[PDB]
Amino acid sequence: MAFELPNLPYGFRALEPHIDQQTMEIHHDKHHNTYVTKLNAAVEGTDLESKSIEEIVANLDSVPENIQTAVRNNGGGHLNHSLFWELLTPNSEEKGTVVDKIKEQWGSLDAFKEEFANQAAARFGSGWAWLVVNDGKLEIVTTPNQDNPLTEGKTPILGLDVWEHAYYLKYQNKRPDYISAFWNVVNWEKVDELYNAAK
Amino acid sequence: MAFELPNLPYGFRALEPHIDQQTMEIHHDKHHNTYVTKLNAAVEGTDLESKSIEEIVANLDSVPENIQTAVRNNGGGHLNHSLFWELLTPNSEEKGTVVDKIKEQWGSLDAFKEEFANQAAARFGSGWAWLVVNDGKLEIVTTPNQDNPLTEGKTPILGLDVWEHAYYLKYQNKRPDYISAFWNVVNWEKVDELYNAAK
Ligand SMILES: [Mn+2]
Ligand SMILES: [Mn+2]
């Protein structure tokens, strides 16, 4: 069926001890796969079936009424996880075009991490924390559920899943320890690629 | 500080093998306790501090603007978990005034379980599934995050936490297996008590 579940760029253990193998397997093979399944079921036989997931999520207001929510939720899930897997790496190095821009705007990388971590922690319920480019400038935003900033005309360049499935097996309630661990596995080359592509 | 974390009516292992000890401990000692902490911080020095949690949640529109969300979220968390612990038991028996009413209205207890389970499963993101009394009649509804039907003038008589923290350690993504397990630990005497109190 139309959309497909992308492979991880790395093995399921790749991100230990920051994110456990069991979570990487369930999160990818089960959670992300379910979004794909339900997205395909929603769009089957529609003009949407053949669009890129980015163009669908960017333009949710153009979706037929009877599948607006299914597409928002499962289309968003598909997009958000596809970005997430590419944004993680076992060989992270905190350097590059966006890291240099973060240091210029926030003053240091720690000051950016603090704001991101605290916005991430403050997202009540399920959702995501993002670094976005909005009209050429960097901003930190959060979204509920599987909503994505593309829908509001902001390009995501880094995202962190703060649904409890993303962290509960290893960290339980300690979302801030998960958030802290995430910095060790950020693919800043991917961030810089997404930043360069931004419209 | 004003509101207090209620004790469980039973021990932390009480609900095994349907809900694991580790989840009961974290869920109560950490998640629920945090709602109490943050609720107290929001209401400290306000006229709200001395109200019952029910009257606060029932009347969220009367909360001062600058703490509306903190009270909705943490007040709701406090109420919802306080109800939840009382609604579980190691000695459940599917009988009573509400079970007889469920069989009359749905036709069987399985038909009610099906609807409840599927509404519970369909609640996207974090939230709760409820059996409520609305103007004397039973209805199944779900709410996001820590919202509670009392706010909309419906009295909850059974609730199931479908935040992933409630089920992830034992069931991971298999929310429906958690939902199915929950039936074994429902305190229908408490349900009948809440039903009898309803205004
Ligand atoms: Mn996720
Ligand atoms: Mn909970």
What distances in angstroms separate CA B183 from CA A38, A47, B109, B139, B190, one per listed residue? 27, 43, 11, 18, 14
Q: Which two tokens stand for residue A180?
A: 């802290």
Backbone angles phi, psi at A191, to 5 degrees: -55, -45
Is A81 annotated as contributing to ligand binding? yes
Distance from Cα A193 to the centre of ligand 2, integer Å: 38
- All structural domains of chain A: 20-89 (1.10.287.990), 90-199 (3.55.40.20)
- The answer to whether residue B21 neighbours chain A at the CB level (below 8 Å) is no
Cβ burial A131-163 (10 Å sphere, 16+ → b, else e): bbbeeeebebbbbbbbbbbbbeebbbbbbbbbb
- Residue with the two structure tokens 């905190």: A94
Closest CA to B116 of B41, B63, B191, B49: B191
Query: CA-CA distance, B33 to B78, in Å (whole number)?
Result: 8
Query: CA-CA distance, B191 to A173, in Å (whole number)?
Result: 29
Query: CA-CA distance, A110 to A103, in Å (whole number)?
Result: 9
Longest CA span, chain A: 50
Point out which residues pair with A140 in neighbouring strands: A131
| Cβ atoms of A163 and A155 closer than 8 Å | no
Closest CA to B175 of B108, B116, B97: B116
- The answer to whether residue B164 neighbours chain A at the CB level (below 8 Å) is yes
> Of A73, A145, A164, which has the smallest distance from its Cβ to B163's Cβ?
A164
Chain B residues touching A72 at Cβ < 8 A: none
Closest CA to A166 of A15, A4, A5, A3: A15
Minimum CA–CA partner of A30 in chain B:
B173
Which residues, by Cβ under 5 Å, contact ligand 2, an ion? Answer: B 161, 163
- End-to-end alpha-carbon separation of chain B, Å? 29
| Cβ atoms of A121 and A164 closer than 8 Å | no
Distance from Cα B163 to the centre of ligand 2, integer Å: 6
> Of B125, B146, B165, which has the smallest distance from its Cβ to A168's Cβ?
B165
Distance from Cα B81 to the centre of ligand 2, integer Å: 6
Closest CA to A138 of A104, A166, A174, A165: A104
Query: CA-CA distance, B151 to B131, in Å (whole number)?
Result: 15
